[PDB]
């Protein structure tokens, strides 16, 4: 029973939003609702425009991805009123003009790249913004003092049905043949909650003469940042190593615990983080779902998480055999509402 | 005249193109690929032959018995290994269209047995016909003992070449790999290197002399462009690296508002 307001600098405009976040499904997006209030003796322009736009901030310039045009004019040329929308109208009165939005499916989520030590001011990333302004015509310029700029974020949550556990196998032989170097690893589950440990079971046996050096364990986050051309990025968000060695003609089996967190990753430039309202800190932006066989021409940042295990041999000059296990890391389903700020404020 | 400036120019870009291929083929996503394991060693044979050529020309221009001792021994071995490893690539296509024990056999053909037939030529220097350093213009008593492997390799290379065209035409006649991106790409470059290089050596063995000097100079560049520059797989990888570098620069160049409140809602 709480709404969000953002008053215009001149005090003649305010936009009411029931929630600041919208759930994105595989092919369905929750519509954006709310009302806008305009005081009398100010609607001489006879045109109220509320626009929802998504832009890619780089460097600076804004590359608009999707732009929505909704007019809240008193004429208002069906759009049935939602229960939340209807409640706002009754409280404010007959001077409130409701507006609605229909975000198309298969769109990038609100993800912002983490700035490096050399701060550049504005945070680079995909941001969704809702703005309302009054003008005689659309082509007329809109002043910041005579408009509001409300920021919203589109987020996704882990599905209620977990998928199959990850599993992959590989075998590499070099110039010696026979006695394959068996290597396989698996994860407890495909979907991992934020902050939950990542446990991987590895089973390595080496019947070859060459020994096995220390095993490298790392978790890599992939950011498919494309705004002009496709360019995949790799970041080792989690990294831990053990000095365990595999003797020839022996079997090795151990479990390694991993935890992705940004406490020690604050100095890693290029990391992808969730939507930031003004300056708050998010937590390792979750993976972006896709509608199975969907086109990969999405102009935005796509986040995917994978687990890579690396084993280096002594070659009697060193060669490595690695098999990568993808996994999913998303937030659970909120009950009441997501707090879009640090709950303990200092 | 053109007998010297053009002669050194032809080999000048051979090492530059080949060494650039070595850097590209050295470490990438396909560093351990079996397909690139043969092309990379083929470039090394060209580099070894080309490097020995340049130092010989420079030493003669400066003028040493000991100076040319290092240079010439690999020069004769490099040209023999160039054709010997050329047969390695030809057999690779035949095996592909027809790793494991093949890799051991392929290494012996290129860097193995030909080294055994090049040593006897270098061994008999103090025993007979020292004539200071090698000039290769004396009587043919010492000839055809190192020209046999290159002539033999050319003859066998035609045997696979005759077999490979019939196999591909018959296979491509009824579906199969008509326009594949793996077998056709290797065969397209193979179909040009084996005949053109093969007919060059045999025809000229038995202003014509000056016309054959730059033909061997461009062999290293011609092989590199047809194996590294023309290859589509590396271009996709090269474009990915180029796009990543360009994108990284773009995102990190150096060149009123009211707070959101709240209100009670009727319910």
């Amino acid at each position: 029973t709480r709404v969000f307001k953002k008053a215009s600098p001149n005090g003649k405009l305010t936009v009411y939003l029931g929630k600041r976040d919208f759930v994105d499904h595989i092919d369905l997006v929750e519509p954006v609702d709310g009302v806008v209030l305009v005081d009398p003796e100010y609607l001489k322009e006879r045109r109220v425009y509320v626009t929802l736009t998504a832009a890619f901030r780089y460097g600076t310039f804004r590359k608009d991805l999707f732009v929505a045009n909704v007019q809240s004019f008193p004429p208002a040329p069906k759009k049935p009123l939602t229960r939340l929308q209807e409640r706002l109208i009754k409280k404010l009165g007959e001077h409130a003009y409701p507006f609605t939005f229909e975000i198309p499916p298969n769109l990038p989520s609100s993800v912002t790249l983490q700035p490096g030590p050399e701060d550049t001011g504005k945070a680079i990333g995909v941001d969704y913004e809702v703005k309302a302004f009054v003008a005689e015509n659309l082509e007329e310029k809109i002043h910041k003092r005579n408009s509001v700029r409300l920021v919203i974020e589109k987020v996704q949550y882990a599905p209620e049905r977990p998928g199959p556990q990850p599993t992959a196998e590989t075998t590499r032989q070099f110039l010696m043949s026979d006695k394959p170097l068996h290597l396989e690893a698996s994860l407890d589950k495909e979907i991992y909650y934020h902050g939950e440990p990542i446990s991987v079971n590895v089973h390595v046996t080496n019947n070859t003469n060459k020994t096995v050096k220390k095993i490298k364990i790392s978790v890599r986050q992939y950011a498919d940042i494309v705004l002009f051309n496709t360019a995949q990025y790799k970041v080792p968000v989690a990294m831990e190593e053990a000095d365990d060695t595999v003797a020839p003609s022996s079997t090795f089996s151990k479990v390694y615990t991993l935890t992705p967190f940004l406490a020690n990753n604050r100095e890693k430039r290029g990391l992808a983080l969730d939507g930031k309202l003004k300056h708050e800190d998010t937590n390792l932006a979750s993976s972006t779902l896709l509608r199975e066989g969907a086109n990969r021409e999405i102009l935005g940042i796509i986040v995917s998480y994978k687990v890579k295990v690396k084993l280096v041999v002594s070659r009697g000059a060193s060669s490595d055999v690695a098999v990568e296990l993808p996994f999913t890391l998303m937030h659970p389903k909120p009950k009441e509402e997501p707090p879009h700020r640090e709950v303990p404020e200092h | 005249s053109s007998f010297q400036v053009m002669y050194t120019v032809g080999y000048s870009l051979s090492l530059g193109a080949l060494l650039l291929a070595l850097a590209i083929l050295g470490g990438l996503s396909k560093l351990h690929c079996t397909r690139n394991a043969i092309h990379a060693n083929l470039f090394a044979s060209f580099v070894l032959k080309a490097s020995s050529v340049l130092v010989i020309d420079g030493l003669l221009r400066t003028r040493a018995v000991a100076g040319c001792r290092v240079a010439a021994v690999f020069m004769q071995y490099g040209i023999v290994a160039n054709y010997c490893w050329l047969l390695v690539e030809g057999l690779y296509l035949h095996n592909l269209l027809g790793e494991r024990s093949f890799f051991s056999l392929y290494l012996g053909i290129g860097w193995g047995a030909p080294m055994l037939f090049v040593v006897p030529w270098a061994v008999v220097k103090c025993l007979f016909e020292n004539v200071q350093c090698w000039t290769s213009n004396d009587n043919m008593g010492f000839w055809w003992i190192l020209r046999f492997p290159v002539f033999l390799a050319i003859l066998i290379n035609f045997f696979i070449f005759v077999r490979i065209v019939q196999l591909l035409v018959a296979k491509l006649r009824a579906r199969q790999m008509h326009h594949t991106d793996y077998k056709f790409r290797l065969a397209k470059s193979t179909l040009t290197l084996i005949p053109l290089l093969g007919v060059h050596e045999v025809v000229f063995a038995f202003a014509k002399l000056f016309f054959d000097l730059f033909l061997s100079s461009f062999q290293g560049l011609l092989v590199a462009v047809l194996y590294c520059f023309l290859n589509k797989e590396v271009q996709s990888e090269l474009r990915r690296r180029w796009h990543r570098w360009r994108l990284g620069k773009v995102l990190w160049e150096e060149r009123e508002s009211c707070t959101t409140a709240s209100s009670s809602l009727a319910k």
Partner: nanobody
Amino acid sequence: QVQLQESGGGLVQAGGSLRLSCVVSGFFFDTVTMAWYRRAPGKHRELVASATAGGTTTYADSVKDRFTISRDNAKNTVYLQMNSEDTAVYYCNTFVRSLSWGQGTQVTVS
């Protein structure tokens, strides 16, 4: 920072008068629509009397022919007077509810 300095109100008898005043600092009154919001002994603040710079004394249907409104841009204030169930606490903001709310003062009709 906007100073919503409102004064006036107290013990009022039936049929009496109770002048109300409100001074707002840090804002302009050239083109703003006052609304003079009034709460209830419960909750769910409502609208009473809206007045712009020039005329347009829009009134709630429950307060017609009982309240009077006035405005003076020169003094930078808004004045409300009442003549003759209305016991509640009164607030002061624009028609768009843009300025921050204040505690206000409450009147009692006896």
